[PDB]
Amino acid sequence: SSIPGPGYCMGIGPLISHGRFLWMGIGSACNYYNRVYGEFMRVWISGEETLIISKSSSMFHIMKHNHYSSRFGSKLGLQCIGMHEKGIIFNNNPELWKTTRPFFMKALSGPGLVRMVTVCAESLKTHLDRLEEVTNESGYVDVLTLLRRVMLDTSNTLFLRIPLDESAIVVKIQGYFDAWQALLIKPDIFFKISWLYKKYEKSVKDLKDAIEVLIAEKRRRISTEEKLEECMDFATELILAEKRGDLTRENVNQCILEMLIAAPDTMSVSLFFMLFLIAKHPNVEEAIIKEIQTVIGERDIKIDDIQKLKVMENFIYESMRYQPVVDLVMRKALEDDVIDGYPVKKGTNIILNIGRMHRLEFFPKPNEFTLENFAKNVPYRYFQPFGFGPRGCAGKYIAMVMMKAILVTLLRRFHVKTLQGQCVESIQKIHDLSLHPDETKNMLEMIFTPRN
């Protein structure tokens, strides 16, 4: 088949579509273009043709095969934030990506995934005892902030473990994300007029310089170390690889950054949304609390419990299905291929619209939040919240551990009330790189009233 999508009006087609992406934001533009044209269609971002695709079949082919193991985005933008051929998240050099990824993969599985379950619990506990740090006079908790801080403290104590300023680094991480989101698909024109992006350049410097301090200390501690054998972790694994010659200081420093931001960026927003669903779905809240009593009682959360928490597992999956945070995934073709019906040349950008896909394909009641959607074992080829295959989410397994850990230890101790009528549906969202609340609005706080 020939490809659906708007006309190439002697080079005005490309201009409107890119501009539409800039105006609407990536995610809403993907949804616009999927709803107007097919569930498989073509658009342009900068010059290059970018396929925006919600068909499960296409998605599955793409993530399965090794010749889509790349992403895309402004070279000048990625250079600006330091992800150009450097980290893994948007590191599009195939070979350099290939050598860096395994470090992350080791750190996010095996023993580190078991350690996580208690690290995550103790970090939330410690923050719930310091709830004055994040609560109003009116008793309104700034959940988003709370979550970001525990996500950071968790990430630090597992992957780096150098003392740091949670409160400050969290703010800087938000700054970095904003920049990342801003510059990812800006046309080169934008970077010439340089009183238009110095704003962001400084947010990046703030975070990058804050982490240099920490990695510098981490470097110091490693050199003057007794049992180097015993106390291994992500940051160290990398630093020793540099100390061989496997990695570059610049690259190390970006990986350590990329590991620290990952959870604060995405987990915190997901759990936030999950908390607003628990608030407005008391039917489900009871089921979860019953399960916690049955399975855990008043014992500390432990790795062996997490498989048993089958209801909460389904709650999480359904929350990510209904109200995703990461609803779209950017890939790129590295070899030519036919994909379902259509031909896809190499160098072709791809945006998999997984959020739309989760409402069009497999589920019984796609457009409403129900655990009936996960009442029968869902095949992984109809529901990819993390993606899969050679470039799927490195955190996918540990992420589920962390989300169960924090929801248990929070809901164990507190009923959660949402202010006013507010629910996830009524929250005003930005829908650009990810799907997250608009924080210039308010009524995003919650109220935490005890149990027992």
Ligand X SMILES: C[C@]12CCC(=O)C=C1CC[C@@H]1[C@@H]2CC[C@]2(C)C(=O)CC[C@@H]12
Applying CB under 6 A, among 149, 218, 356, 391 the residue interacting with ligand HEM is 391
Number of residues that bind ligand X (CB under 6 A): 12
60 binds ligand HEM (CB under 6 A): no
Query: Residues 86-105: x/- map of binding to ligand HEM (CB under 6 A)?
Result: --xx-----------x--x-
Tell the smallest beta-carbon distance from residue 384 to ligand HEM (Å): 7
| Residue 450 token pair | 């005890």
Residue 238 interaction partner, one of ligand X, ligand HEM, none, beta carbon < 5-8 Å per kind: none
Burial class (CB in 10 A: 0-12, 13-18, 19+), 441: exposed
Report if residue 330 touches ligand X, rule: CB under 6 A: yes
**Residue 328 binds to ligand X (criterion: CB under 6 A):** yes
- Asked if residue 120 belongs to a known ligand binding site, the reply is no
8 A C-beta contact, residue 219 and residue 239: yes
71 or 429: CB nearest ligand X: 71
Residue number, 179 or 329, with CB nearest to ligand HEM: 329
**Contact status: 270 vs ligand HEM (CB under 6 A):** yes
Residue 328 binds which of ligand X, ligand HEM, none (CB < 5-8 A, kind-dependent): ligand X
From the list ligand HEM, ligand X, none, partner contacted by residue 418 (C-beta under 5 to 8 A by kind): none
Long-range contacts of 388-396 (CB under 8 A, 24+ apart): 388/63, 388/64, 389/63, 389/64, 389/65, 389/66, 389/69, 390/66, 390/69, 391/63, 391/68, 391/69, 391/70, 391/101, 391/331, 392/63, 394/88, 394/101, 394/104, 394/105, 394/108, 395/108, 395/262, 395/263
Contact of residue 270 among ligand X, ligand HEM, none (CB under 5-8 Å per partner type): ligand HEM
Q: Is 393 annotated as a binding residue?
A: yes
Q: How far is CA 129 from CA 94, 139, 289, in A?
A: 45, 15, 21
Regarding 266 and contact with ligand HEM (CB under 6 A), the answer is: yes
Q: Does 312 bind ligand HEM (CB under 6 A)?
A: no
Burial track 43-68 (b if 16+ CB lie within 10 A, e otherwise): bbbbeebbbbbbbbebbbbbbebebb
Rounded distance between C-alpha atoms, residue 387 and residue 27, angstroms: 17
Q: Is 152 in the site for ligand X (CB under 6 A)?
A: no
| Cβ nearer to ligand HEM, comparing 108 with 164 | 108
**Which residue number, 184 or 393, has a Cβ lying nearer to ligand HEM?**
393
Is 262 one of the binding residues for ligand HEM (CB under 6 A)?
A: yes
Q: From residue 7 to residue 46, what is the string marking binding to ligand HEM with x (rule CB under 6 A)?
A: ----------------------------------------
Site for ligand HEM (CB under 6 A): which residue of 241, 394, 424, 435?
A: 394
Give the whole-angstrom CA distance, residue 249 versus residue 177: 22
Residue 304 marked as a ligand binder: no
Contact string (CB under 6 A) for ligand X, positions 206-245, x = contact:
----------------------------------------
* Shortest separation between residue 287's beta carbon and ligand X, angstroms: 29
Long-range contacts of 380-385 (CB under 8 A, 24+ apart): 381/56, 381/60, 382/56, 383/317, 383/321, 383/358, 384/59, 384/60, 384/63, 384/354, 384/357, 385/317, 385/320, 385/321, 385/324, 385/326, 385/354, 385/358
DSSP state of 338: E
Footprint (CB under 6 A) of ligand X, residues 379-438: 433-434
- Which residue from 24, 39, 124, 35 is spatially nearest to 339, judged by alpha carbons? 39
Report the residue from 45, 329, 357, 444 that binds ligand X according to the rule CB under 6 A.
Answer: 329
Using rule CB under 6 A, residue 267 touches ligand HEM = yes
What are the φ/ψ torsions at residue 342 (nearest 5 degrees)? -100, 155
Residues 6+ apart with CB under 8 A from 102: none
Task: Indicate the DSSP class of residue 163.
Answer: -
Tokens of 275: 């908390």
> Which residue stretch of 28-36, 199-207, 248-256, 258-266 sits at the interface with ligand HEM (rule: CB under 6 A)?
258-266
Residues near ligand HEM (CB under 6 A) are 63, 88-89, 101, 104, 108, 259, 262-263, 266-267, 270, 320, 325-326, 329, 385-387, 391-395, 399
Residues near ligand X (CB under 6 A) are 71, 89, 261-262, 265-266, 326, 328-330, 433-434
